Amino acid sequence: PGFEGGQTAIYRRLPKFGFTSQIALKTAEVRLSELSKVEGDIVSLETLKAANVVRRDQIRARIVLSGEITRAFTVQGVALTKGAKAAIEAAGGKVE
Amino acid sequence: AKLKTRRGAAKRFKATANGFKRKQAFKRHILTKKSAKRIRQLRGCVMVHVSDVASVRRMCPYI
Amino acid sequence: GSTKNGRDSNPKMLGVKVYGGQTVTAGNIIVRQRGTEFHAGANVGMGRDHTLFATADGVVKFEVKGQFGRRYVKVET
Amino acid sequence: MRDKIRLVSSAGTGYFYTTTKNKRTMPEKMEIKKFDPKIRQHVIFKEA
RNA sequence: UAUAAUGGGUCAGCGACUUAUAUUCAGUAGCGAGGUUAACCGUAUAGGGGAGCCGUAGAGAAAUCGAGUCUUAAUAGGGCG
RNA sequence: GAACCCACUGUCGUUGAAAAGCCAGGGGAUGACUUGUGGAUAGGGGUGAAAGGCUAAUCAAGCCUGGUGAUAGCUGGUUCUCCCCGAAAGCUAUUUAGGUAGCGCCUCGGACGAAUACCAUAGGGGGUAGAGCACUGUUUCGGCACCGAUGCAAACUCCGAAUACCUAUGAGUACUAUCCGGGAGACAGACUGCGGGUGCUAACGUCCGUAGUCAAGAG
RNA sequence: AUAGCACUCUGCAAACACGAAAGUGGACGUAUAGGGUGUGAUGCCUGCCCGGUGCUGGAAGGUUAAUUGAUGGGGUUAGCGUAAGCGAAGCUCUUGAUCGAAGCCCCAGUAAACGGCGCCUAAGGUAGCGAAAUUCCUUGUCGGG
RNA sequence: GAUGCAGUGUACCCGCGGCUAGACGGAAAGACCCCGUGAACCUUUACUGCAGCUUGACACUGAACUUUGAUUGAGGUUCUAACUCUGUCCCGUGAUCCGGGACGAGGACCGUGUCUGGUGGGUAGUUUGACUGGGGCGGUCUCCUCCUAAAGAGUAACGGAGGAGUACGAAGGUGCGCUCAGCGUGGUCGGAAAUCACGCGUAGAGUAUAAAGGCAAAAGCGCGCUUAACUGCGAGACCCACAAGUCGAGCAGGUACGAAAGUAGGUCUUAGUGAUCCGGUGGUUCUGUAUGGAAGGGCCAUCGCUCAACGGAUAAAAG
């Protein structure tokens, strides 16, 4: 596969570009709706790992507006975007 | 066994929502004679062609 | 012996792309010409390689006009 | 043959253009006014 | 190709698209914004085991941001969503 | 010149008596002679009065086993039945030319719904057939480099069709047209008619465009 | 292949060959002997060229391998200063001053070394032979049979 | 190149002896020829490595005297203790090996290990292109223009005929301004042919370069000022298997020319060219492996050798 009769292949006649980032492999992305899986009102890296929404080897996580929530959630140690923070405050939770 | 990636093609292709993005060639060393519009337009990233997406998928089973 | 011939250049695909009576949008190319067989009329621009394109939305029309009899192509809004 | 030469901005921004010259017809260095995007102002570019 | 192109003297028996793993698509079945366990334990096709994988969000080389994001001086325009 | 050693000519034999012989002739025959028993030299090595000769009927690198089921764009073969649809021998690239990859052509599933085709009407560009000498070139006969008659041209044109191509509208007859995806095969073509190059206005010759048939189709 | 002839190497723990070494043959020999190379009884003989390659001797005028290590630039680190973004010891990254033989360059000899023998070169065939195992035209021409 | 097809001629059924005209008779997947990015062996001033030989530095490796160069370097003469003896004698010993002891001849040499320059067909792995009216020799391989090409595009042959691998800081931008060339008459050494006056017809001149398509708002020619030969883009279309290629109104920022509308993102256009990997230079609100840095990497701009067999087997290769 990838051999096209002798002429320079597509994957070799185009240039290499980019470098890999290590911190991206440890950063975690979390949906707002996924917080419903967390037992209790505390949102943290430990509680997320306990709920199995973040892998045990990640060091930091972020929450993005993707779905909806109904319970109040006090968020600690997790990065919150503008929409996610607005949704949490509307639901009645607090940050830090 | 487990399928193996073609690392050379992985280093040239990257994953998007509905396809693959690449850069453009003809911009490494010989550049003085090239015109300004050529220099600008060949800059940036474009999309992989449909006739080549199948080969790219075969070469990159996971990304 | 041998032959001193057997050289030719690749094709260039010249010609009239849009014919009279058709509808075009601004930017459409009308004539691909090595020289000015046709000259630019109202709402028609000339490129650096003598190409003719439409600078407005309308309908193409060919005419013969002028003292020299130059062939003109224009776009009616 | 015509040599390839680099014109550098006088402002010191590091910006440079490239061109070609014929030594016999232009033995000396070449200076010309051009636009410098780094400062958004026309300045004098001098041959390297 | 009747070819004067190849193969077969005849009969009986044997003789060629498989198996393991990974991945994509199709059909069908369970569950369903969720789905599913591996090694292993287990008087063992049961039951336990949630580490892990896939989906749920993109943009960017990256930092980073996020229903937006990259380029730019530009809340212009344009690319990808 | 016998024994012994050898192998120059010819006949027969060639599924032989014989996987190298017989018959009739022939050379050496005290020598660098012939021969018995035992021993030494082992494979990129041994030995060779040197022919690449010999090394167990095997030698431009012995034989046996193992790597081992070596690789083979090559040749060959591939086993029961019925129904539907149905190609190609082209372009581009190639350490390529009898291989392969993308596109073109086949089939199956999903979205889609005339946006498709034939014909009629309306609009549009051309530089071919033909013709011509106004440019370029070339040709003959005449009168003072010019002029009057006169002929020719793939790379000449003052001219110039029929066809073909593009767009829009419309009746009728036709499940057409486009997009996404699963699976391919194929990239050695042949003849005939029309327009041509090449050849000798030769070839069941060769190379192109265009249409029919064979290929894959009997009567 | 051969007797004969010539060139060249070897002073003995010889040259040379085999082997991984130990060692073995050469040889229980000692230049009149051993190894390699060419020619090939015998008679008459064996011409010219050292330009090219090789071999032999000398020169030491030029080049640099390891090694060596002068200097040059840079990273970090200390100490002053409201303020200048100043800036060292040590550690450490890199640079290559100089030293350095052979080979190569250069000079001379060597052809019974490999080789060459038409205005030009190293020089353009001495004897002897010649339609000759060498002659295309060629069944060249004359004599004999 | 027919026992088996068409037409036609001849021919009752079956042996034995003999013969070789045919059954493209039997025998051996043609050895001649061509192909496969097949094999083997041989050659060399094909490519690349190694054994062997050869040079030097360090180590094994010491001492006493001597002369000369910048505490230190290089030579020369001696000595014995490291070390050599396929030299004599003694013993193990009944022994041409070996080991130890005595003597003799040498001796810091020779020789061995590590590193390093040269030589190296002795040996080893390999390479030595394609097209082609069979192959070889010859010629060609990329780009541009005209014909073949059958009035849209495209279209082949070892078909016909020519060019390219550049040039230019003005030969670019802009304001203003001007038309060529050949002919007929008179004049200085100037006439076929020099500079200059007028007149008739007429684009037949020129446009850096080959040809075609063009050129009066001349795209041809001259002068003054200048650097738009710009930065960030870009609606829309042409061409195309891909990689690639081409035209472009308009928006924002600085600029030159012009009183102004306005023109200018190089040159009348179509050839003047090379992908990817590696490496160099300048900048970078990126990254930078415990932390602060740095090194290294990413990004923007740009540079270099080769790939002309010109989509470029590994920048190394013949018979």
From Swiss-Prot, chain A:
Gene Ontology annotations for the cellular component aspect, listed alphabetically: cytosolic large ribosomal subunit
Tree of life domain: Bacteria
GO biological process, one term: translation
GO molecular function: rRNA binding; structural constituent of ribosome
Keyword terms, alphabetized: Ribonucleoprotein, Ribosomal protein, RNA-binding, rRNA-binding
Subunit architecture: Part of the 50S ribosomal subunit.
UniProt family annotation: Belongs to the universal ribosomal protein uL15 family.
Protein name listed in UniProt: Large ribosomal subunit protein uL15
Species name: Acinetobacter baumannii (strain AB0057)
Designated gene of the protein: rplO
Curated annotation (Swiss-Prot), chain B:
Xref: Gene3D superfamilies: 4.10.410.60
Keywords in alphabetical order: Ribonucleoprotein, Ribosomal protein
GO biological process, alphabetically ordered: translation
Lineage top rank: taxon: Bacteria
Residue ranges of coiled coil: none
Family matches, as Pfam families: Ribosomal_L35p (PF01632)
GO cellular component: cytosolic large ribosomal subunit
A GO term for molecular function: structural constituent of ribosome
Family: Belongs to the bacterial ribosomal protein bL35 family.
PANTHER family listed in its UniProt record: 54S RIBOSOMAL PROTEIN BL35M, LARGE RIBOSOMAL SUBUNIT PROTEIN BL35M
Protein name: Large ribosomal subunit protein bL35
Organism: Acinetobacter baumannii (strain AB0057)
Gene: rpmI
From Swiss-Prot, chain C:
MF term (GO), any: structural constituent of ribosome
SUPFAM superfamilies: Ribosomal L27 protein-like
One GO term (biological process): translation
Region described as Disordered: spans on this chain: 1-13
Entry annotated with the keyword Ribosomal protein: yes
Entry-linked Pfam families: Ribosomal_L27
InterPro entries assigned: Ribosomal_bL27, Ribosomal_bL27_CS
Superkingdom: Bacteria
Keywords: Ribonucleoprotein, Ribosomal protein
Gene3D superfamilies per the UniProt record, alphabetical: 2.40.50.100
GO cellular component: cytosolic large ribosomal subunit
HAMAP family assigned to the protein according to its UniProt record, in alphabetical order: Ribosomal_bL27
Family under the similarity heading: Belongs to the bacterial ribosomal protein bL27 family.
UniProt-listed NCBIfam families: L27
Name the UniProt record assigns to this protein: Large ribosomal subunit protein bL27
Organism of this sequence: Acinetobacter baumannii (strain AB0057)
Gene expressing this chain: rpmA
